[PDB]
């Protein structure tokens, strides 16, 4: 296979991890709209939403790790230029950085809503 197909998969799968989290938050906000805001409930929403974030961050770490694996398996391939493999590790770190940052944003956005 291709080095760039590793890059594709990583992004599609990371994008997928992230919209999964956003979607869980959108539905979460709708469930919260039918409940009276209370300080203890406000303490319960944040814990839930933060714990959801973590699940999403973990999903993304796993995509990177599997992409790194896929990058290494191409190592044992003469038909793959070994000197291009680093670049893939780098590319998947940049997507991870992006994915995590977008999760941090979506969380930050949400916590504002729960406390506002």
């Amino acid at each position: 296979g291709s080095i760039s197909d590793i890059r594709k998969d990583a992004e599609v799968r990371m994008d997928k991890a992230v919209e999964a989290f956003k979607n869980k938050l959108d539905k979460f906000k709708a469930a919260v709209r039918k409940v009276f805001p209370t300080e203890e409930r406000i303490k319960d929403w944040l814990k839930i939403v933060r714990g959801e974030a973590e699940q999403a961050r973990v999903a993304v770490r796993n995509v990177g790790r599997d992409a790194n694996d896929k990058a290494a398996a191409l190592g044992k391939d003469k038909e793959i230029n070994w000197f291009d493999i680093s670049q893939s590790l780098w590319d998947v770190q940049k997507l991870t950085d992006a994915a995590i940052k977008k999760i941090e944003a979506a969380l930050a956005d949400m916590e504002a809503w729960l406390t506002q």
Partner: antibody
Amino acid sequence: VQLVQSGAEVKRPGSSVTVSCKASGGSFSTYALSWVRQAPGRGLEWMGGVIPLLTITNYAPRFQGRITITADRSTSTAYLELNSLRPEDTAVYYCAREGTTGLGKPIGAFAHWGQGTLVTVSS
Amino acid sequence: EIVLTQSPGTQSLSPGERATLSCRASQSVGNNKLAWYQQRPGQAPRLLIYGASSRPSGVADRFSGSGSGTDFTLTISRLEPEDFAVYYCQQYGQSLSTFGQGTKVEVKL
């Protein structure tokens, strides 16, 4: 980025040599580290390399069967083990690491070089 | 396997002259992954050019690289004395990286 190599070593034929190379500064896990040698008065020759994150190795066919390259991630140290030595293996062994653009994008070309380690195989 | 070949073997020039060094590959270098290194006596090689024409920061602009495919050139426009050294090309366009045999540029006094 600084690479520092182990010291000179005098070996007999049939012995193994293990050269060490520690990255000081820089990111280490993710950048390709190559070993490259130079026999007295002769050209540079590429031997092989390793990307440390998952020990992704790449050996030159002419050494396959004699060579092993590994990296210890905590100590930023890469390793060349050369087995079954012969007088033709008398060279200076340089560790060399790929350069970045500007952590930065990897370029392949060896931007960073160690001070070389002299291995003399003496009958 | 890609055999790289440098021409001429030796180069005898005065300071201020323009030196042009050749490197030719038996087959095409994958994605023009060719590097040019300078090695002064008793010293480890120094990267001058990469990806055929890219110059890394800190390398003087009198060094430049060009060519594609199987035919490559390094040019040193105005030799300074400290340029007396051996120059190798490298290709890393496939997993078996291989170097040229070397051009020695002799300056003069």
